[PDB]
Amino acid sequence: NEQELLELDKWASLWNWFNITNWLWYIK
């Protein structure tokens, strides 16, 4: 939709990924 948001949306994937890494730490 907007290239201005897309520039930040690329790095926003690390924000969601970090949640999975921290969650796995609670299980293991």
UniProtKB/Swiss-Prot annotation:
Carbohydrate-modified residues: 19
Region (MPER): 7-28
Lipid bilayer topology: Single-pass type I membrane protein
Subcellular location: Virion membrane; Host cell membrane; Host endosome membrane
Known partners and oligomeric status: The mature envelope protein (Env) consists of a homotrimer of non-covalently associated gp120-gp41 heterodimers. The resulting complex protrudes from the virus surface as a spike. There seems to be as few as 10 spikes on the average virion.
Function description: Acts as a class I viral fusion protein. Under the current model, the protein has at least 3 conformational states: pre-fusion native state, pre-hairpin intermediate state, and post-fusion hairpin state. During fusion of viral and target intracellular membranes, the coiled coil regions (heptad repeats) assume a trimer-of-hairpins structure, positioning the fusion peptide in close proximity to the C-terminal region of the ectodomain. The formation of this structure appears to drive apposition and subsequent fusion of viral and target cell membranes.
UniProt protein name: Transmembrane protein gp41
Organism of this sequence: Human immunodeficiency virus type 1 group M subtype B (isolate SC) (HIV-1)
Shown residues in whole-protein numbering: 656 to 683 of 856
